[PDB]
Amino acid sequence: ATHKPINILEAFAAAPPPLDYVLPNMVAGTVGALVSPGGAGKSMLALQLAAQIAGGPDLLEVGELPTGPVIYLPAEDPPTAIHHRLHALGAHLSAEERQAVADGLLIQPLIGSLPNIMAPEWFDGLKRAAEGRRLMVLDTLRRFHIEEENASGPMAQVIGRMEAIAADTGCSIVFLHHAVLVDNIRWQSYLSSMTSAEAEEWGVDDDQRRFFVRFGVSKANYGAPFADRWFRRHDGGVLKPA
Amino acid sequence: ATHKPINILEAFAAAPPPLDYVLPNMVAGTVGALVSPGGAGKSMLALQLAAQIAGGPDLLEVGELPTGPVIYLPAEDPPTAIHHRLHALGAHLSAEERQAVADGLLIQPLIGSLPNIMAPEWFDGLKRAAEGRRLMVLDTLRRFHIEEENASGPMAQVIGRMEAIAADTGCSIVFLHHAVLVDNIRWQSYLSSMTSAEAEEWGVDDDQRRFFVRFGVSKANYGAPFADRWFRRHDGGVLKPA
Amino acid sequence: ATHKPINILEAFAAAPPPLDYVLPNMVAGTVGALVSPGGAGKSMLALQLAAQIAGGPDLLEVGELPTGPVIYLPAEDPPTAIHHRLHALGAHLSAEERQAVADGLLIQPLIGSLPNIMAPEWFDGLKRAAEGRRLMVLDTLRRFHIEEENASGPMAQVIGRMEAIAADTGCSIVFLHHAVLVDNIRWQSYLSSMTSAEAEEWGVDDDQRRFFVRFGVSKANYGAPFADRWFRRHDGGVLKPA
Amino acid sequence: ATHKPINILEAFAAAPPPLDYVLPNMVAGTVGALVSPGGAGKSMLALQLAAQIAGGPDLLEVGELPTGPVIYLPAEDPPTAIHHRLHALGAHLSAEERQAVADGLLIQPLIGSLPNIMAPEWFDGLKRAAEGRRLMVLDTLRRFHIEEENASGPMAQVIGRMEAIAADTGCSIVFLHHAVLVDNIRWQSYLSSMTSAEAEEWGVDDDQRRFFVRFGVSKANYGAPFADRWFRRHDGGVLKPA
Amino acid sequence: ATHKPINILEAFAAAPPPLDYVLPNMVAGTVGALVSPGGAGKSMLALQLAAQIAGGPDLLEVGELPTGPVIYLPAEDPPTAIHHRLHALGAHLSAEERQAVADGLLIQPLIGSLPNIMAPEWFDGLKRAAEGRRLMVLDTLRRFHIEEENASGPMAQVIGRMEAIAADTGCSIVFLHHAVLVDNIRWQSYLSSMTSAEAEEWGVDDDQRRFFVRFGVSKANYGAPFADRWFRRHDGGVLKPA
Amino acid sequence: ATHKPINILEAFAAAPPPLDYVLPNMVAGTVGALVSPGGAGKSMLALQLAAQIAGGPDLLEVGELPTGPVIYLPAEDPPTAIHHRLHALGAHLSAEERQAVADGLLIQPLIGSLPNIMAPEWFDGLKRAAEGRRLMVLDTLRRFHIEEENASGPMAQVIGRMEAIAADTGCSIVFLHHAVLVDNIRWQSYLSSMTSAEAEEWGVDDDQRRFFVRFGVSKANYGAPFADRWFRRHDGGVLKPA
């Protein structure tokens, strides 16, 4: 991506428009990450977040978010598991809310598709898929490159390419990661399954500790502090404040 | 493999077909793993699960499962040992059950065959062998690739290829692993021999502990939790509830 | 860069001109680093030092500094965030000061541009942008190269190149680093948020400690010791003694 | 090596011939390992096992074993050391037993020959030497390859090639290893010098625990458990039950 | 470099010329190291030893050393900083002494020059610059090669080239190192800023111990043990016994 | 190197010639190592062992060893330190002993000669130098290869090459090593400087322990145990029993 030099005098003179946030504390046009131990329901959280930005309700009750076309790229779930998740989520959506989501959200399954962002054709296809879109969700990043996630040089290139896409197209990119990467990224959120100790601080009890997860923004550089939230795993995995 | 975009409107409206499970909690068309030290009888367990999905009896008494053609690829056992394990298993089967196993099961020995899923001819061969099949069992994964099992990059390519074969042909793939794969595999089961501790918890004493192993599903995403199970090792290794 | 042999007798005789400092304890024409953890305010502190050297006011009350053209290269902030920082900073400047800053500061956004100092075009480009300038600020170094930041050989090459540019053009280079490449940079400054401990050695309870940061020069070779300083984070992020 | 698909029905019906064991618990035609710390007698034990299978006496008093041609490849002992070991062992054999050993045992010294199983000439050579033979002993594996023994990929290839030769020719291969080449090799045996503590459990005071070593099978899949054994290191190194 | 076989008989008969030491315990014609952190001021110490060997006074009061042409290669300091260091040191020298230093010392600045001893042109250049010279000081080694200072293989090549230059020209080479090399360098000296401990252990108080540094020879092979020494840091960094 | 198949019958019948030892417990025609920390006297010990084997006295008190032409390759000491070492040692030799050493000992200095056994010309040169010689000493191995000393694959190749030369020529090779390379070497010996412990155990108080070092064979596979010895460092380093 390229940029005009900043016009100092203008910035001084005109009070700027509020910062455009695609997600809590995440500036639109940048790259962010959603981290979690493979088993907390990152995919469901991302689907709901994507459904919201595409037009849907704020079921998760995180701030109200601006709306825009969203593209979700699940590379680790079979199409049928996606259908079931959507059907479940839908039970919480009105006829209007469902049509909104269907209107703004495109889900392109990629399981076994072998996307490689460092390869020409995939870089080009992802860039094009990002054009005119507000958010692009990669689930999970492990499936979009063949590099060692512990090597800072290769990862700088892989994250660089996503930044190049987000900056050029204006489409924000959020990748999911199975818990380096966190040190590169400027916005990072997490999801973690409730623990013993935690099941003994607000209430509840074990055997039931698996119907709850905590979400929160672990790292950001702008905006008011986002308060860690608790979510109850309803049927099919759908998440709600609770 | 390639996929069509999800019809979101449909998934929200129509009741989705129940998930097709190839194994307890494992969605058909995906990749899973059966983990264990190796001397816990992974091969025998795999052969019985393979025989059951092929059309055989539910000797292990795990759930009754949908049937379909199965191909088992043992790369670490000499043919003669495979013969011995079958003859032993055969004693637990009626003639009708034996014929059903033979009708739906193909066992292609590969010891010393040096298959490499990363090489073109083998990838092509493995994919063609997966066509029209419900399950393909790789025993063990270590013998189907020449990459560093500790390097997430090469392993993501290895596993990616299995997901490609599975998604493109609809044939589920389960590989045995002698213990990351834990992170990038959504279904994982395990087997572990009983030690001095467990023996002194259910009955039996040591010097008899070598006749017990517990199964159980270590990681899943969909379905009702699968309760661990204990099996006793009969003559020739055959496993039954007990 | 090249240099002629030192005229030893001439160095013995004439008391040399005072050492030209671009920043406290940093000799003009060299390479330096500003270190700090992801979120502490590196970017804002760097913009204020750059605005000061460009010709603006010494709002940080760090020593008065020689002025000259400055180029700031933010590769991690979306242009809009740069606008907000400038607008907030502008409220602390007179019309004259704003004009002076605009007359000497060039801010060229590079988010998603993927500059690589190891590649020839970027090397030549960075060097031409340095000509006739007093200070070049790289924010942050991680975005100006694709090497492993833990590999001393590649990092030696990356830093050698900044030194080649600085020695050739006389333009000092300061890079920001998200907290080894520290053993070799001769000038090093730091910025750290106020610890719970510190916020109870000077005043104000916690829940306030987040509005303060400590600056100080962590490593230098020339000059009178620079004293650590405390800054309060005013509206927009702007820093002032306080 | 290649194999015909298993005839499942024929395996169910016919009682298979007894499992052919080249060594206790080791199926003929497979690959196995003899493990121990550097100096402890791996070589003498290997030489006695090879002399036995070749047609010689069961001095070790391990089971009675099927005989057949054997080739022993010592790559770490000068020829003269081999002569000394044979001369000493010979003093425990009748003229008949000596002749029998010389009739079925071929010992081809390889010190400084640099065999590389990953290279074509050596692979072809090793394979041709295995043909028509019951057992091939590699002493020690470290000298038959130039790979990193800690790298699973390369070792999978090195081990795969021994499995190819064994499956193709019917000749079993046992390699010695100076203590992963364990999680994959199905048969594993060990030799450990007597503990500074193990003496105070069977008799014999210390400073004498050196003339003793214990044998035993560390890993297997078939056969009745093999009982660990103790051997006394007579003159020349020759091992007798004791 | 090449050498003729040692005449053994001769060396046994004829008494050998005393060993020629370039520095305390360092044999002329070899490679040595001066190690220290960052702010201990090894550049100044190096400049003084270099001035002394060039024909200057023994200001440090280490032993009296044979004189000869010296070339100093500072690759980490701007020329102006060198000018200042020389001017300061000069105030401690008589006219005659200054003249002597200028007569035997050549200081060629190399900051941003990117010397690489592994490259042909630089190897050749350093070699020619070493001819007819008694000492060559590299300040610091990190700036004369691009290899990983942790990798013994590359460092063995880096160090071997210095030894090649030292042996072929008779010019000793001493490189400074900011703290393996330690293991493969026969002569090693060090410098460390006085500790808070050593402070209240000699007669000095804190916030004043910053003016003290201990020198000493950390490793050698020949000669009378060199006693550690304490130096006080006067204006400009100049070091005197004190 | 190549070898004829062992003649089993001949070995059984003829009592073999005693094992030809080049050094205590080291069979002639093999590869061994002398290990020790940077400062201990390895080179003097080696020079003396070399002198003995070449014809000289058993100054060291180690048993009596057969004699033959020896070639010593010091790559880390300047020729002059060698002369001084020889001259010192010669003070303990008769006119006859000196002429003996001079007759069978060849010392070819290689400091800065950059030998690389993995390179064609050097391998060939080292082999030819080993022809018709009884011992070849490499001091130290670090200077004869450019590989990573803790990488088993490359080291196997480096050690393989020495074994190839020793086996093919009959010349034994001993390399010195600054303390992996022990797991591929069958004969290892060491030297350790007496520290504050063994001192207050065998006599001599500190301040005098630097004059003592203990020898001893850390690893072998043949022969009568060699007892750790103590040596007193005389003038010039010459080692004597004491």
Curated annotation (Swiss-Prot), chains A, B, C, D, E, F:
GO terms for biological process: plasmid maintenance. The keyword Nucleotide-binding applies. SUPFAM superfamilies: P-loop containing nucleoside triphosphate hydrolases. GO terms for molecular function: ATP binding. Keywords: ATP-binding, Nucleotide-binding, Plasmid, Plasmid copy control. Pfam families: AAA_25. This protein is involved in regulating the plasmid copy-number. Increasing the level of this protein results in a higher plasmid copy-number. This is Regulatory protein RepA. It comes from Escherichia coli.
